[PDB]
Write a structure and sequence with these properties.
- The complex is a heterohexamer, with four copies of chain A and two copies of chain B.
- Chain A has 46 residues and is mainly α.
- Helices cover 52% and strands 0% of the residues of chain A.
- Chain A contains three helices and no strands.
- The longest helix of chain A is centred in the first third of the chain and has 11 residues.
- The radius of gyration of chain A is 10 Å and the shape is globular.
- With 809 residues, chain B is mainly beta.
- In chain B, the strands form 14 sheets. In chain B, strands 1, 2, 3, 4 and 5 form a five-stranded parallel sheet that branches. A five-stranded parallel sheet of chain B has the order 15-17-18-19-20.
- Chain B starts with a strand and ends with a strand.
- In chain B, 34% of the residues are buried.
- Classes of the chains: A mainly alpha (46), B mainly beta (809).
- Chains C and F meet through loops of C and loops of F.
């Protein structure tokens, strides 16, 4: 599982120049339970 | 005398008269409720016949009585106990002293509560009369508040007429009633001193005796007693203990209750050379010679309780003891004392419990496995809520039945685990082999309150690196990240100096801050994204040859839906490397002859561990002036965990809102050094050297010694040469001693004319050298006799041969 | 004034391409997120000088490169915080490059707080104070702490305070139009107090005529896919939504004929942020409630303004891990939980691990339940009624407990200890008394356990049980009561007895020294001594002050300068089962200042030191005055003290000898130490000489020898401890060749 | 209603020179519930 | 030998670049590793 | 020399409403059983 300050790095590994998409909780799917690649890449801007 | 079956006595005194004719009680002896009777009623009655109590002796609220000296002046030794104590003397109004001087041994049981005038209570050393003082506890009484003038016999006259013993760091004289004294002292000839008159007692005979070697002269007996003397084991022909009784003695004991119907006496039987009150499990009786035998009728020993529940607060167990089955249990023992060795001694024989088990407010014991062959709880009767097992307020439990080998079965009922502060939840999940996981209902556990001070940590850390090469130790271990890397809030390193490998989780703790354990807190290390390198957290000791022990704990804040359990590391022993020694502990060298010096020293305890000693000797030069002088807190833990949870929640919140020449001797500390001059000083250097490939000495201690001189070595041999001149000048020359004691300093010249008095003169070393002898001037004419004596630093020599010289008129 | 244009709030993440939208403009918040793939260079050619006022909060997170927000927001003034970010109106987080703030024009935070944390580059945290906002900003800026004389209005460079309706700052002081920020509200060209009727109130800061919200209403009516809000007029206020009790005719919030509570069917049916209490503020029917307020911060009071309007919750209430709660009284207007949903185990009410929950004062409360200290549990069991319909299966300090009113035969309180005696309520079997427990704590607005006294028969004197309470402040009032402990019986009800809570104020003691005294010499003859009302005096309360003259140093007159033990104890007491079980077998000058903290001590010399004693006194027949504190002060010296009157006398001798005599000052500055004699030849330079007190006394003046022939002029100046006196009149003389 | 030793202090007053009877006990009878003179008379020797 | 042991630990894991840190904050072994790694 | 109960009674009589603080035998009871006592010490043996 990735929790906390991993995520800011973790999400960048899946987001990059694309930025991050906007307009339960994320830590739930990341910290509480194992988070795969798909949920990480979904948060980035399409 | 006769073996009178046990009896109880109350407000009146006439019934007491039945004890005159019997020398042994086949049971228990009670004297209570002696309300409105006066001391004149008791001081005229004595029972020296009674020798034996088999069950229990008790006196309670007896008014008028002063002591048991006259009542039982020969009660020698006390099977079915009262509560925990053979002599229970409770709430006494006029009683003052114990008086059971002949009562010598109670191997099973102990002995005072709320007696406002009974003194001489703690002066008796109970370690020998009773097996374990752990059951004994002196409480509110007259002697509870120290106001007694405990004057033992002979102390007033200053004579040690009675033995003195040491306990709790204090060595004082002991006595029973200030006229008699102890019956328990030497055991195996430990303290003794005088006992009866002046001699110790051997091992087989217990306290007090007139002669050690002779068992007959030993009044008491430790293990067994033939009719006349103690024996290491009771001979074939010839008791419940401490004694030996012939086969018919037990036959007579059995026949006594065979023909007499009394509720309280006991069919005494024989088994295993013993006169035991009852046969063991699987043994029955068929009359004959009354020897217990087995049979093909194997039946368990069943206790049939009248009260229904033998509420266990040690005679509860003892009445239960011997029973392989109990037909009815609740335990409420307190005090924190480990009486459990007794409990398994009694309950270890229990193999079945028809009723249920309840354990409430228990504080004394530490482990539950003392039900060694329990193997079954029938639970015919159960607690409210139908609990075959009940545990509550259990403030000292640590370990349940180790289900590794145990195979308990529960016929019916449930279990109850509530307020189990020091109980490991792993143990609770371990009981679910018992077959209690399924069944009808499930009401067994109170989750939160089980494991409050103690716990059950599951994860162990593989300790990696340790460095103890000096008086300091580095510790490096594996770093552990929980599923949530925040959830580990640090590491709780625990360690304490462990002399022996008997260390457990707690090892005691003091509320005044005098905790045995040493605790430090290590913040979690920084981490990187790549798992290739993790900066392993470490620590270092604050100050070596003793042994040291380390075991690591974590710190995790619990969460409702998180499986967080923390981490642990086992206890591990490490020791340092060699250190410098200390100086030989205060040596001294004293010259033991004119040519020898004996040196002695001590082993310095500043270094502790493997121990040679080096001894240098060096001459000291003589003084120059002698050659020229003319001689003639949880309150903050709740906080910290709350703010830690708050920090984690705030961060995840922000994410959810942002995302999508010497001699040496070994171990011996004395030496003789020879080959020394008679009157010189030798300085000796001491080096204690705790290592022998390059031997490692310490700093040195400097001592010295001057050998004893020899005065006769200063004597001048032969007469004194003399010359006479015409001007009344007489010149004298002598011989210097070959080996003077240190240095000759002056000469004494004595001369006397024929028929006249004597005169003396001193010639210093400077005077002797300047004049090349000694010249006397102005001597009157006539004949003179002269002698010369030498003098050195050590002392004086001997006079030379007289010399006669004449001066012409 | 407002020299700019409004803009609804936004968040920007991608790069430095969209932030340029803020050159010209907020109706909300500015978020600068996820600015990770840029460098200090992109930020360094950007600025936003127009921003003067932002409403709710300001957030910058995951921004790499920017060294400081200096020149980002060079003119922004105040945040109000109609909305807040988790109690906070300002958050900047994980700034690997931000080094200093640069928000120097910041003035006020009306509501909420500020959260700045976890920046491995940010500094200057200790040089900023949050007391003024809800010392400096940078190496280039400093905090503009306006004086309290300006209150919250603001101050100018000369120190003049801003207009009353000005808030924080003002483009011109005492001008509601020229306000940088309005104190309460804003009209088109003038800050105003309370929105003259036509311009109803708007987000508690603006005055807007019908057009603003009307437009907003039309936007919402034409919007079928955006969650905008239909603002309505009522109480002279344009509001996002009318409160409960008012309805819409769609033609102003009009009162409803029938009861119209305001329901709140929140999503997911289950909700755990003062932000959340901010949405559900004004609800009456929560159509679906938790308390997990952590931290321990006193927040329910503000939540009292949010939950003081709620009536019925359509789901379970759980008070879980509520480490910060103090009460449940803030459900002032809640009436009856709706039997719509429960919890596991049917705990429609679920209390768990609270930490400061000192419940409703049910002497007046009539809250009802539909489904789902023990004292209060019984209060709920009978008064609230969790009995009968439900079965059984329904540990701490204080915890008001129950029993049966008792009393106290004797109360005594003088300084710090209280003697308490009462009638022993012997239970129907007074062996039931495990022991009394006396309860007592501080009551500006503690147990002891007592073994039962040895009861003596007859109604005669019994030496009734009691105790001495050992802790009080010598003026604070305390609350004390007793509730017993009777052993429970199988078939005999026995609750025991409790005493009614009694309030006791111990008598005052001698006061203590006042706090922070200064002895500042406000004049050559006056010294203002100031202090503060101390908290240590432990009693009621004038202040008594003495001042004494102090002589000068003698050396100056002659110097020449020219945890288990508790359970072991409670379990051992053998004293309760051994005897009990064996029972089954035996029976088969000075001044005083009142209500003020300043005193102008007068009658003082110009340059004489004063040692001043000060203490407090809680009464005026025998003084109980506080401890004495001694300070030292010196009044302002006067130059006229050291002046010398008249010219200087001299005598001339033919052998180049000049004798000089002058008058010593009569009342110098304490004491004069020496004199300076300056002489200059006609047409030549100057020369100086020092004459000490000993030199003057021995020589009876001053002797000048070796003087060259010609004309000379001489002056004299006297030197004192404070300084030097005025120069004497010049004197001319001649030296013969 | 008595306590401990006081229980026998009055019980002997209940009993006197009558002696004491010899040869859900009194804990359930004179410890929790009130104990009155009539029942204490039973423990006294008849 | 106090300073001796100090330097020992240091190297295993003395100027103004670390004395100020040791005075301002408590002891840490991560300190002694990070100021020896470069 | 006085016993503990008599000493406590005497100090209570002297004090009045101050109560009693028994003094653990190294306190007033030891000194009274060995030497004399006065009214200038009881201020430390009063009930707090």
């Amino acid at each position: 599982t990735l929790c906390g300050a991993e995520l800011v790095d973790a999400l960048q590994f899946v987001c990059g120049d694309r930025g991050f998409y906007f307009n339960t909780g994320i830590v739930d799917e990341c910290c509480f339970r194992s988070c795969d690649l798909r949920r990480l890449e979904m948060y980035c801007a399409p | 005398g006769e073996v009178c079956p046990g009896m109880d006595i109350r407000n009146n005194l006439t019934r007491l008269h039945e004890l005159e004719n019997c020398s042994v009680i086949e049971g228990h002896l009670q004297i209570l409720l002696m309300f409105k009777t006066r001391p004149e009623d008791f001081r005229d009655l004595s029972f020296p016949k009674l020798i034996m109590i088999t069950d229990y002796l008790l006196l309670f609220r007896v008014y008028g009585l002063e002591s048991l000296k006259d009542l039982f002046p020969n009660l020698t030794v006390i099977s079915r106990l009262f509560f925990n104590y053979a002599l229970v003397i409770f709430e006494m109004v006029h009683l003052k002293e114990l008086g059971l001087y002949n009562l010598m041994n109670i191997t099973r049981g102990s002995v005072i509560e709320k007696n406002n005038e009974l003194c001489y209570l703690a002066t008796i050393d109970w370690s020998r009369i009773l097996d374990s003082v752990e059951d004994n506890y002196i409480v509110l009484n007259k002697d509870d508040n120290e106001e007694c003038g405990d004057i033992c016999p002979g102390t007033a006259k200053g004579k040690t007429n009675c033995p003195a013993t040491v306990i709790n760091g204090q060595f004082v004289e002991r006595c029973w009633t200030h006229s008699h004294c102890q019956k328990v002292c030497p055991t195996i000839c430990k303290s003794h001193g005088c006992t009866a008159e002046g001699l110790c007692c051997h091992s087989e005979c217990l306290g007090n005796c007139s002669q050690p070697d002779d068992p007959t002269k030993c009044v008491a007996c430790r293990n067994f007693y033939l009719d006349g003397r103690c024996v290491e084991t009771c001979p074939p022909p010839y008791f419940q203990d401490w004694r030996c009784v012939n086969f018919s003695f037990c036959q007579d004991l059995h026949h006594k209750c065979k023909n007499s119907r009394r509720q309280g006496c006991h069919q005494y039987v024989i088994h295993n050379n013993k006169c035991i009150p009852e046969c063991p499990s699987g043994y029955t009786m068929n009359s004959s010679n009354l020897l217990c035998t087995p049979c093909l009728g194997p039946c368990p020993k069943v206790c049939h309780l009248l009260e229904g529940e033998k509420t266990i607060d040690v005679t509860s167990a003892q009445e239960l003891r011997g029973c392989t089955v109990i037909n009815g249990l609740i335990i409420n023992i307190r005090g924190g004392n480990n009486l459990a060795a007794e409990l398994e001694a009694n309950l270890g024989l229990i193999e079945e419990i028809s009723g249920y088990l309840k354990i409430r407010r228990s504080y004394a014991l530490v482990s539950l496995s003392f039900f060694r062959k329990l193997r079954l709880i029938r639970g015919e009767t159960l607690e409210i809520g139908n609990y075959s097992f009940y545990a509550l307020d259990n403030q000292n439990l640590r370990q349940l039945w180790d289900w590794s080998k145990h195979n308990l079965t529960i016929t019916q009922g449930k279990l109850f685990f509530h307020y189990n502060p020091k109980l490991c939840l792993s143990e609770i999940h371990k009981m679910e082999v018992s077959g209690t996981k399924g069944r009808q209902e499930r009401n067994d556990i109170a989750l939160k309150t089980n494991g409050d001070q103690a716990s059950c940590e599951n994860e162990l850390l593989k300790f990696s690196y340790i460095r103890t090469s000096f008086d300091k130790i580095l510790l490096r271990w594996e770093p552990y990240w929980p599923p949530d890397f925040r959830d580990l809030l640090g590491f709780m390193l625990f360690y304490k100096e462990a002399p022996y490998q008997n260390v457990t989780e707690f090892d005691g703790q003091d509320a005044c801050g005098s905790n045995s354990w040493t605790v430090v807190d290590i913040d979690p290390p920084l981490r990187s994204n790549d798992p290739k390198s993790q900066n392993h957290p470490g620590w270092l000791m604050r100050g070596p040859w003793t042994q040291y022990a380390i075991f690591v704990k974590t710190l995790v804040t619990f969460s409702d839906e998180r499986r967080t359990y923390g981490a642990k590391s086992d206890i591990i022993y490490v020791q340092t490397d060699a250190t410098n020694p200390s100086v030989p502990l205060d040596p001294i060298s004293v010259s033991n002859s004119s040519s020898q010096i004996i040196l002695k020293w001590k082993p310095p305890s500043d270094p502790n561990g493997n121990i040679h000693y080096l001894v240098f000797w060096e001459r000291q030069a003589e003084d120059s002036e002698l050659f020229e002088l003319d001689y003639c807190t949880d309150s903050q833990i709740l906080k910290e965990l709350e703010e830690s949870s708050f920090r984690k929640t705030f961060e995840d919140y922000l994410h959810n809102v942002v995302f999508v020449p010497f001699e040496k001797v070994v171990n011996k500390e004395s030496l003789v050094i020879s080959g020394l001059r008679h009157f010189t000083g030798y300085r000796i250097e001491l080096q204690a050297c705790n290592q022998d490939p390059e031997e490692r000495c310490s700093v040195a201690a400097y001592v010295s010694a001057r050998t004893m001189p020899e005065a006769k070595a200063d004597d001048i041999v032969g007469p004194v040469t003399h010359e006479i001149f015409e001007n009344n000048v007489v010149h004298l020359m002598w011989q210097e001693p070959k080996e003077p004691n240190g240095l000759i300093v002056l000469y004494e010249v004595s001369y006397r004319r024929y028929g006249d008095e004597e005169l003396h003169l001193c010639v210093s070393r400077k005077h002797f050298a300047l004049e090349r002898g000694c010249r006397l001037r102005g001597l009157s004419p006539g004949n003179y006799s002269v002698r010369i004596r030498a003098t050195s630093l050590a002392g004086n020599g001997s006079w030379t041969e007289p010399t006669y010289f004449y001066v012409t008129d």
